[PDB]
């Protein structure tokens, strides 16, 4: 009846807006029973990703909880019917711990706005990662981040030479893969940054036009850049921001024009819930927007068909996918600040190598 | 060479909101020149149309101008390259004139909001309609609306049995159309409508619930009727509302839910502009949203396929399309007038003879 120190982040206090990473979190030690029932699993952290998106998962999650997150783990020990054996990697939401149990099986999300079940942990082979796409590839571009940006663009857009594209949020992994898909695909790219040198980043990434988001502040001054960067309207329009830059763009859609919405943060972090209503500008141009919630992409099958066309893209160096590995499980909550605020210095995945 | 006397209703003002038809509009003579060039032709207008989308067309026609309008008219005399020859009856955009001369040919409707294209006139053919679908019926369910209705049935929503579809603006041909289509794909159907008279003729009709959206002033009042309306959610979601009816089905999108989008009256009659963001309710639902604008299916091929799919059940007694045609050219604006009115005597598609 053995028990082992393990080390975690959890949630002091409920804030919302942009969290401050300091004061939300509190580092704990805590006790794990590290006794297994039959198919349990003892696991240590190797990579923790830190995402926007975990705004709304801590604001979701009773006070003094661990903080969930996307991690790497390795099985230390497991009971006699476990999906795995000592030793396996696995890729799941195994949260700000250094250790954990868990039988890895798929778990309702209680607390959340919606019935969302976090999937069964996946298990990872080395064969995939070498030293162009290494095993924390997992959390990014062969991992979630990826996998939304490769369903998105292989399974609803259908980007045509010609095309302009509009990504929003495109500094991220997310919309640099698929700006960059989209130019593969023969589009005009035109995306939105926060500084000069984000957005020279983003044209050296191949985009053709970047747009500042903190100088085009309304839908006005952002009606007037896109006009300029996408002077034949849109085809395309990936979301992450929503806001006045997404009323901006349903002004000038395109005939047989596609929304993808992948996220709005100017309304889940910035609560901008009312606005111009976007409906009555779809008809003319038959637009069709599809929301998405890429874990339902989660496949065996969709994983291997990401490591052929996307993991083969990435290696012969036809598409950059960065992370931004910061070491140390204390710099879990220093590494997500840096995701709000101070996004200068930010290229891509940010992760933590325990 | 000669001339013919003919009367026009002409736009003598501009009326924002809900049409004031009687200070719109003024009935002119027009003695039009009968001399024809080579493909032009000289018609005589047998039906009009009234529609709500007509409150648009007219913002956008220039005072003086002839009000347009979808009609049935008949080919009095023709040039030798005409498309169409005398005693030909055609479909197409003749507007409230008792003549005109056309060449048939698209026409770009210059002054649009958007550039639109008003299509070729479409020639009829006698024999396919009966005492069951009579002539008139090329303004309604073998016309404009009923194309409207069955293309979306058929080329986006995926109806199947056990959905709960809900239709706003249920009372006309198309919300009609649509709930009955519905039905026969295995859906519970839910509707809104104005009266109790309404009401009753949609149940009757085979609707499950209908809405009274004149009791449901509010998003909040609407979330509740529906609710009960629809327990299950909304899987499939007809609008021709807009406003706070769209606000409340949003909340309760379910998986893999389909909107289409036919007509925003909530904000181009009432003049509703703004609401609550509805993109960050569809991104766990993966909904999909799909503007509609139903001049993209006007082809022959799927001219053919209505009348084979809906003639046979319209004639067989399967599929309702009632007709509310009021006699009189003089009276035609006091027809437009009762869709925004004086809707609770209306029954189905409102055209006039003339
Ligand atoms: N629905 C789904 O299935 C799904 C799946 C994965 C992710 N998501 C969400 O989708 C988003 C996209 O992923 P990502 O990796 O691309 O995220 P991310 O870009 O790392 O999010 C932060 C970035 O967005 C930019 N940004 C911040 N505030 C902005 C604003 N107000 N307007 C415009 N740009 C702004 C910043 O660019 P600068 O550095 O240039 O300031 C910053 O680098 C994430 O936020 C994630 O939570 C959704
Ligand atoms: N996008 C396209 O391609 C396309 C093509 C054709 C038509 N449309 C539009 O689609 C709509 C449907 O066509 P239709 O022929 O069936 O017209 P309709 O529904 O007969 O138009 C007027 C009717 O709508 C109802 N109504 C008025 N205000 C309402 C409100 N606030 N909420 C709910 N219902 C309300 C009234 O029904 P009660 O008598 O029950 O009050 C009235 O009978 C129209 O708006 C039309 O212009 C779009
Ligand atoms: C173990 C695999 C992990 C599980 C994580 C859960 C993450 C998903 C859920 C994360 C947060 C959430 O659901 N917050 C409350 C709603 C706010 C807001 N509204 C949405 O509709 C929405 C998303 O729809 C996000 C989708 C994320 C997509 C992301 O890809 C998933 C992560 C995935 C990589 C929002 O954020
Ligand atoms: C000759 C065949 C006729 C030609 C007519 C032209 C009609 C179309 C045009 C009618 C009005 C319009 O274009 N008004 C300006 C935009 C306001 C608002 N925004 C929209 O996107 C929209 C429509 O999307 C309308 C679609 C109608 C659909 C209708 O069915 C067509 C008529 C059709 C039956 C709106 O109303």
């Given at each position: ?18 969290p401050?990473?300091?004061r939300?979190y509190?580092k704990?030690e805590?006790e ?7 198919e349990?699993?003892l696991?240590k952290?190797?990579?923790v ?14 006070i003094?909880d661990?903080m ?14 476990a999906?795995?054996?000592?030793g396996?990697l696995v890729?799941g ?14 778990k ?12 069964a ?13 290494p ?6 571009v ?6 939304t ?8 857009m ?9 990504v929003?949020g ?5 919309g640099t893969?698929?700006?960059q898909?989209?130019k593969?695909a023969?589009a ?8 000069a040198?984000?957005?020279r980043?983003?044209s ?10 903190k ?6 001054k952002?009606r007037?850049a896109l006009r ?18 997404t ?6 859609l395109?005939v047989?024009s596609?929304?993808?919405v ?6 889940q972090v ?8 976007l ?8 637009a ?36 931004t590995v ?5 710099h ?10 101070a996004?200068?210095?930010?290229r891509?995945?940010?992760?933590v190598?325990?």
């Amino acid at each position: 009846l053995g028990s082992m120190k393990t080390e975690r982040w959890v949630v002091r206090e409920h804030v919302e807006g942009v969290p401050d990473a300091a004061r939300i979190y509190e580092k704990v030690e805590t006790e794990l029973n590290t006794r297994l029932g039959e198919e349990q699993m003892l696991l240590k952290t190797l990579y923790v990703s830190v995402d926007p998106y975990l705004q709304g998962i801590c604001l979701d999650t009773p006070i003094g909880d661990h903080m969930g997150a996307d991690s790497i783990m390795q099985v230390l020990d497991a009971g006699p019917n476990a999906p795995f054996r000592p030793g396996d990697l696995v890729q799941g939401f195994g949260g700000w711990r250094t250790h954990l149990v868990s039988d890895g099986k798929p778990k309702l999300w209680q607390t959340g706005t919606f019935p969302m079940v976090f999937p069964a942990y996946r298990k990872l082979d080395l064969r995939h990662y070498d030293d162009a796409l290494p095993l924390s590839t997992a959390l990014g571009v062969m991992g979630g981040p990826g996998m939304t940006a490769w369903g998105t663009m292989t399974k609803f857009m259908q980007v045509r030479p010609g095309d302009t594209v509009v990504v929003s949020g495109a500094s991220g992994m997310i919309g640099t893969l698929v700006g960059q898909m989209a130019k593969r695909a023969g589009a005009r790219v035109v995306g939105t940054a926060g500084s000069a040198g984000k957005a020279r980043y983003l044209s050296q990434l191949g985009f053709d036009a970047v747009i500042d988001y903190k100088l085009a502040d309304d839908a006005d001054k952002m009606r007037e850049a896109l006009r300029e960067a996408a002077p034949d309207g849109v085809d395309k329009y990936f979301d992450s921001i929503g806001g006045s830059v997404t009323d901006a763009v349903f002004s000038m859609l395109n005939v047989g024009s596609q929304v993808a919405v992948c996220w709005q943060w100017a309304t889940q972090v910035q609560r901008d819930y009312h606005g111009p209503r976007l409906l009555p500008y779809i008809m003319f141009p038959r637009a069709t927007i599809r929301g998405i919630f890429s874990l339902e992409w989660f496949t065996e099958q969709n994983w291997s068909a990401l490591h052929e066309e996307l993991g083969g893209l990435v290696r012969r160096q036809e598409l950059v996918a960065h992370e931004t590995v910061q070491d140390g499980f204390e710099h879990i909550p220093a590494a997500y600040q840096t995701l709000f605020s101070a996004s200068e210095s930010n290229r891509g995945k940010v992760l933590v190598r325990v």
